Design a protein around this nucleic acid. Sequence first.
RNA 1: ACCCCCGCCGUUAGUUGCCAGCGGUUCGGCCGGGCACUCUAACGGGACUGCCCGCGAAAGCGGGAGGAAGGAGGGGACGACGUCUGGUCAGCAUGGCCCUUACGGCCUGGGCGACACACGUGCUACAAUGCCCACUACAAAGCGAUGCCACCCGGCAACGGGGAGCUAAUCGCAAAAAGGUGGGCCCAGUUCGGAUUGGGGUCUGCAACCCGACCCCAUGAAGCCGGAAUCGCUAGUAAUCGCGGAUCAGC
Lengths: 60, 83, 155, 23, 97, 116, 127, 97
Amino acid sequence: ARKALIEKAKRTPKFKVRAYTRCVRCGRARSVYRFFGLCRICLRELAHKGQLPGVRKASW
Amino acid sequence: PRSLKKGVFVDDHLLEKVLELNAKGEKRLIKTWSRRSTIVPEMVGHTIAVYNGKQHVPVYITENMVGHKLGEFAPTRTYRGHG
Amino acid sequence: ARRRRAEVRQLQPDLVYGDVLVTAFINKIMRDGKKNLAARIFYDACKIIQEKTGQEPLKVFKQAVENVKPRMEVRSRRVGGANYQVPMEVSPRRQQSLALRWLVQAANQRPERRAAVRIAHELMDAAEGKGGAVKKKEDVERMAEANRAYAHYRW
Amino acid sequence: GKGDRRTRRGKIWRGTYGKYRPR
Amino acid sequence: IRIKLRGFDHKTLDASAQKIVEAARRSGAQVSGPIPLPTRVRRFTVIRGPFKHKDSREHFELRTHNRLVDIINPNRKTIEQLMTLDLPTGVEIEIKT
Amino acid sequence: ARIAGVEIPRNKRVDVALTYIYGIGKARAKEALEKTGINPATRVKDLTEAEVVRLREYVENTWKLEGELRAEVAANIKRLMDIGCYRGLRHRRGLPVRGQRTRTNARTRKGPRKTV
Amino acid sequence: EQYYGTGRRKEAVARVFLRPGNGKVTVNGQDFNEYFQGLVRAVAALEPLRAVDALGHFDAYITVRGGGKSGQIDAIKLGIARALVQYNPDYRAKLKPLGFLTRDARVVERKKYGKHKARRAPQYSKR
Amino acid sequence: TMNITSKQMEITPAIRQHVADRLAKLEKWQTHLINPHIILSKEPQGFVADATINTPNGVLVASGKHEDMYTAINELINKLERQLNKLQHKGEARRAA
RNA sequence: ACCCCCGCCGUUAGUUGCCAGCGGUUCGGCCGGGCACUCUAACGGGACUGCCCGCGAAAGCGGGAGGAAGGAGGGGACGACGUCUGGUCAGCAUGGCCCUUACGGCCUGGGCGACACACGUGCUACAAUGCCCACUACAAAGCGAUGCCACCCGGCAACGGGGAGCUAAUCGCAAAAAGGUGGGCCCAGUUCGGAUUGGGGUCUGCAACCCGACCCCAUGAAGCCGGAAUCGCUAGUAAUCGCGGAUCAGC
Ligand SMILES: [Mg+2]
Ligand SMILES: [Mg+2]
Ligand SMILES: [Mg+2]
Ligand SMILES: [Mg+2]
Ligand SMILES: [Mg+2]
Ligand SMILES: [Mg+2]
Ligand SMILES: [Mg+2]
Ligand SMILES: [Mg+2]
Ligand SMILES: [Mg+2]
Ligand SMILES: [Mg+2]
Ligand SMILES: [Mg+2]
Ligand SMILES: [Mg+2]
Ligand SMILES: [Mg+2]
Ligand SMILES: [Mg+2]
Ligand SMILES: [Mg+2]
Ligand SMILES: [Mg+2]
Ligand SMILES: [Mg+2]
Ligand SMILES: [Mg+2]
Ligand SMILES: [Mg+2]
Ligand SMILES: [Mg+2]
Ligand SMILES: [Mg+2]
Ligand SMILES: [Mg+2]
Ligand SMILES: [Mg+2]
Ligand SMILES: [Mg+2]
Ligand SMILES: [Mg+2]
Ligand SMILES: [Mg+2]
Ligand SMILES: [Mg+2]
Ligand SMILES: [Mg+2]
Ligand SMILES: [Mg+2]
Ligand SMILES: [Mg+2]
Ligand SMILES: [Mg+2]
Ligand SMILES: [Mg+2]
Ligand SMILES: [Mg+2]
Ligand SMILES: [Mg+2]
Ligand SMILES: [Mg+2]
Ligand SMILES: [Mg+2]
Ligand SMILES: [Mg+2]
Ligand SMILES: [Zn+2]
C-alpha cells in the first residue's frame, strides 16, 4: 500500500475529517509539516541541498 | 457525551428500516453495521443483528436499554481469562 | 575532580547581619530554590531566640556552630582485606559545612510544628551544648577517638 | 494538588478553567 | 506616506531599505530612517535519522526579518521614480499611507 | 446517629464536618449553611439545637444520602450488569469502566498483585 | 539635575534616576518598599550608594521592566552603582572591588536536545 | 523477576521454561540475579542467545552463537558463569599484601 | 580557528516601541512634542597571557593591575581513519527473490487501546519550608485571516449568543506560577492525596459502545518517603515554578 495510498490522500474525502497531510515529496503519512508540504526527513534533505529559502541551520 | 444541542443520533439507513417494520408490524432480523447508532424507544422488542467486527450478533432490546449505543450488546473482544 | 582543587564559593553577606556564615545556614534551610521562604524562617527563628532567650540571636548562632563543628572524624579506607574506620581531622571548611547540615537536619527531626520554631530551638539547645545536632557531633568524635588505633593509616 | 481537577492549583496544571478557576 | 519590507534574507532587506532611503531623500523630501523591526522566528526541529534515534535531532530556522521606512513630507517627484525602483529577488514590498 | 444518619465530627468546622456524610462534599457543604443560615466556621461542638434542627432538616429532605444513595448506585449497576452492556461487563469482571489501559497498571479496580 | 546608569541582569533592565534629596526611592511610579514588599533580597538593591556614604543624600526615580522581582533588584544595584560613577568618576575604587561596577553575565543556559533541561540527562538502565 | 525476548522468531512456553531452567545454573553462586534478561535471535549463521544481568557486584553481558539454538543457549550460560565467578572472587585476589 | 547566541561598548535606525524635561493630561505616554533612555536588528569595537612581577632554555604556569568580560569569557553549531557483518527494503531510492480476479485495489465494521503477570520511561503524591479561598505583583519566547479573539451578556461551569481590534513591535492568545499581604486548616489517611465509580452537562466531529478531551454534583483508593539494586547533576547548574510551539478537527 503506497502509490495507492498517496493517491487516496490527494483526492477529496467522503467526509471532512479524513483530511490527512501526506508528504508531497515521499508520501509519508507521519511527521508532516504544514508549512512545507514535507515530512521531517525530506524537510531536512532539501534544506541541506539549499532548495529551502531562508531555511538554514539554527545555532544558538 | 454527544452534545444535547444536536440530535440524539441514528444512521438514517437504520431508522427508516426500523420504521418500515412499524407499518407492517415487527419483527425481523435486522443485520446491521451500525454500532454508531443509539437505541430508540421505537427499537424495543426488535432483535437487531449487531456487527462486532466478525459476526452479526443477535441482540434482543428492552425498556431498560434505551440511552445506550448499538455496540454495547455486541461486545468485540473474546477473553475467557488468563491461563 | 581530578586536576586542580576546587575553589571555595564566596557567599554574599546577608542583608540583616552581613555574616557570611549566616548566608550558608539559610540556604541549608532552603528547599526547592524558594530562598525567600527560607530567608524568612531563619529570621523568624531569631525573633524567637531573642524573646525566648534575651540576647543576640546572632551570637547564639555562632556558638551553636562552634559547638557542632566536629574536630576529628572517620573516613572509611580499605586496608588489605578489611574496611577500616580511619580517624582524621576535619578541614576547617568542612567543619562549617557539616555543622551547618547537621544543625538544620537535627532541627527537622523535631515535634514543634513550624519550621520557624525548630530552627530556633535546635539552634538554642546546640548553642549551649545540648541538642540532637551535637548528638551527631558528639558521636562523630567518639568514632574518631575509639579508632585512635588505626591513625598511622592516616593520609 | 497539581492533579486534583477540583482546585485552583489543579486547573492551572490540567490547563483548563472551571468553577474553581474562572477567567 | 510609508513603505514596509518583508524578506528572508537580511543583507538584502537592509540593502533595499538603504536604497529607498536614498531614493526619496535625494528626491524630496523628508524620510524617517529605515527602522529595524523585530524578526518573527519560525523554527523547525527534526530527528536526524530516518528510524528510531530519538535524541539526536537537527535544528533549523526561518528568519523573516522586518523593515519599515517613512518618506515624511511626500512630494510626488519621489512617488514617480519609485515605480522606477530596482528590488532584489528575496524581498517583498508593502506600501500604504 | 444524628445528621443524616451519621454523627458528624464535633470540634470541627460545620462545613467540613458535613462532608463526612455519604452524599455530601465541599459543594453541598457551602449549600446547606447558606440555606439554613449558619457560619461555616462554627464548630459542630457549638451548634444551637435550633441550628441542629435547621441543618439536619435541610440536608435529609433535599439530597439522597447514605443508604438510599448506595442502593441507587448499586441498582444503577445492578441493571447495568444485568442488561448486558459493555459498561456492565467490566463491572461483572472487577475490571475498569472508563476505557483505560489494562496491560499495565489498572490496579485499583483489580487490586494488589496476583502472581503466576 | 539628574544621574543615570543602565542596569541589566538576566532578561531584566534597570533605569535609575538619581536626584539629590532626602534619600527617598521610587520604582515605576510605585514606592520602593511597596514594590518589593516582603522580599528580604531588597535592601541590597539600594546597596552601592552605601559603599560611598550616599544613602540619604540622593533620591531615586526608577523604571524597571522585564525579568523577575530579584534580577530586577540586582540590575538596580548595577544601575545606581553605574550613575554614581558618572556623577563622580573618583568613585572607581570604592565600588569596583565591591564588584558593583560589573554585571554578572550568568544567564539561563539553553535546554538541549536529548536532555531534560540544560543539563539533567534522562534516566537510563543497563539492567 | 525474569524476562525473555524472542526476536523475529516464534517460540513456545516449553522453550521459554527450559531457558528459565538453564539460567538457574547461575543460582549456585548465591548472589542476586536482578532482572535477568534473555534475548533469543536467529542469524543466518545459527541462533543467538543474549543476556544482561545485574548482581550486587556488577553485570553479566553475554552472547552465545550456534547452529543449535539449545547449544547457543548453553554457551551463553558458560560465558555468564565465568563472568559471575570472576565477579565474586576478583575481590579476594589482593587480600595480602 | 573562521559561523550563531548570550556578556560590555559605539555607529546607523525612530513606528506599531521607548518617555528623561515643557505644555496640556478627556485621567489611557491618552495628545502635543522629542529618540534622550528602553528596545528593536543590523554594522563594527573589544581579550591578545598584551601589561607588571616572579618561575622558566623555551612553550608555558603562578600571581597583581586596567576592564563589562582574563587565560578556552559562559553556551551552541561542528564528530578524524574507523568500529560495532550497529539501525532503517516501513521515508526514500535500490539488485535479486517472490504475488497477479490478488500477497494488488475499494469500503463498512473491528483491531492497533486485549490483561493472570513481568520490565523501562515518566506524571501526582504521601504533606505545616505544607493545603485551601481572597486579594497584590515580576518574565521570556513564540503562535495567531473556515485564525487569535478583546468586551458585553445567558451560564456554578465547561461552554453558548452577540460582537470590536489585528495580513499583526499596533489587535489577541494573556492569567504567567512559584512569589507577596491576608485569612482558614492544627498533625489526623486529614481541608493530605486525587485513583476508582455513580449521575448530570459542554465542545470537536458524518460518528465519541468499543475509544476523545473538558465541566459540575457525588465517590474520595492506594499511599505515613519506598528491599536488593540504581539515575542525574560541578552554577545561573541541580532543585523547584509556570509559559509557548511543532504535529493537530479533537485528543
Ligand atoms: Mg514505494
Ligand atoms: Mg485528523
Ligand atoms: Mg500527517
Ligand atoms: Mg543528623
Ligand atoms: Mg484535595
Ligand atoms: Mg509539587
Ligand atoms: Mg526521550
Ligand atoms: Mg463527603
Ligand atoms: Mg482513556
Ligand atoms: Mg483499554
Ligand atoms: Mg537582547
Ligand atoms: Mg520588605
Ligand atoms: Mg529553566
Ligand atoms: Mg550484542
Ligand atoms: Mg576465569
Ligand atoms: Mg542613537
Ligand atoms: Mg596561565
Ligand atoms: Mg572546531
Ligand atoms: Mg545485522
Ligand atoms: Mg521500500
Ligand atoms: Mg527490494
Ligand atoms: Mg477501514
Ligand atoms: Mg478501530
Ligand atoms: Mg502502539
Ligand atoms: Mg508519565
Ligand atoms: Mg479516607
Ligand atoms: Mg481529604
Ligand atoms: Mg471514542
Ligand atoms: Mg494504608
Ligand atoms: Mg502524618
Ligand atoms: Mg526518596
Ligand atoms: Mg519530596
Ligand atoms: Mg542500596
Ligand atoms: Mg562537567
Ligand atoms: Mg507547557
Ligand atoms: Mg498551538
Ligand atoms: Mg491541538
Ligand atoms: Zn518526505
